[PDB]
């Protein structure tokens, strides 16, 4: 519906700091001033970070909003969006939603900002599809396909979650930014139908092969640091062989830079003699690799799980 | 022209390092062995960094080519790149080239790494209205005005130079990535116009005022710490009252963390109770300030000439 007549700020938005964010964006002197629908109308973004809001309701007659941006607040409910059309930009980092169910018919959406909201699942994205800059860091979400349609996508920051499956980037042909750094990655290759990509944050997941990105031309920023590999368990036994994981650019093996139990290297197999049985085995490396168009470190432990 | 008939690799290309780099493009095993056009028109990209390049000569014969690589290298000759027109990607960066007059025609190009190139000049540029991507960084380069007709950039990086005007920028409504740490830059007031900027990059210029940046919806990463502020002399005398020009987000005034010379603070004018002469005073600042969507550091130096 709409505001019939001139009502009170504060009785159209019951949160006193929103209250307080209206009023300033509305020109008026006093929460308790009337405003009417031609004033809602004329409001087009409405920014309170770090204020103590607990709900939203009134925005539902900012027919004209085109960004809302409530950072570090306490809201939990997003009803009162569900019908907002011209909203291109939505930041509501640091809220208890626990879902975003009410946003997925806010198709109008092109920035987003989910960090640490408490959310599990980005089905209701997979409907975003005008979505150009996503935020998901600091969320337990271990599945990423929702944003398999997502073409228009061209930042994309998942940091510290719990992603490994980044099969579903492989479409998103505008991404140029993409950070990960801290999740579960252990296999790149989708990365490697990315050609737009400028920079790419993967420090600290399970990445052996760095290989997908050797033909990337846009590619200038990419972090590989502190990879932690764990390869499937094979046998003990004394005459130990086993395979080298961990691949460069060109895709030729990288030599270890220290390797555990008195252990040795002939590309591609290091082997150990051992005479006593332990749960495993292990090995560094750090190497100064070279993309398209620059060199960066890359560097990691892997772990080899051990049978008996 | 074009190789008529097979000839030598290493007779088309006589810098002994790139002529490798073409063997292995073109899939031969010797800088010797023969290519026809044939060949060279299969080559989309010619990577070389670190291996000693001095000359780019035969390049001219690779019709097809998408992607040069040449980052530091001693290139000095960029004329075989002339009739190039199908060059999306060009990685120059750490070359001593000093000017760039032999790309100006080449319109195809989208991505552009000019980074410690010894230039000074861009002009050669500003036909370049296909670029996206731009690296300008650690070049003496003072003036960017000819980067105002750049309308598809995206990305661009001007780190470690001489610039202060930003005016050339307020057209450029695609960009989202702005890096421009070390700078001379004063005022940042065409940044207003640029209403998709995600990043930039402002650490240690001389920037006074930020609310330029206020309206920002989509700015995510702000960096402008260690600013160096040196405000125009004014007339040395016992009772010395001076506006303070250091303005946060909202526009109003930033109170300072220390004044010189024991003196005060009563927003908006700093004063001192001076009895002998001085160069001059100062006052120092640091802040969190908030953005459209986030909070971050603001800080810096300011000091007043005084006259006598």
Redesign the interface.
Known sequence: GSITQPTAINVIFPDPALANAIKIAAGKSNVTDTVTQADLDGIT?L?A??TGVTTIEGVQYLNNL??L?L?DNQITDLAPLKNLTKI??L?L?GNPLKNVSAIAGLQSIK?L?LTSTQITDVTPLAGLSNLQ?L?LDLNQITNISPLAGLTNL??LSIGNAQVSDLTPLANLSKL??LKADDNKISDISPLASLPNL?EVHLKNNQISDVSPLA?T??L?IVTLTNQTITNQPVFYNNNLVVPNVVKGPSGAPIAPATISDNGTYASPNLTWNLTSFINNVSYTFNQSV?F????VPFSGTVTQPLTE
Chains 1, 2 share one sequence.
Do not use: A, H, L, R
């Open positions: 973004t920014s970070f770090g085109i960004g941006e950072k291109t930009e930041e980092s920035t900002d800059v935020y061209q930042y140029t930014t400028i033909n031309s846009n200038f070279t398209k168009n620059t060199t």
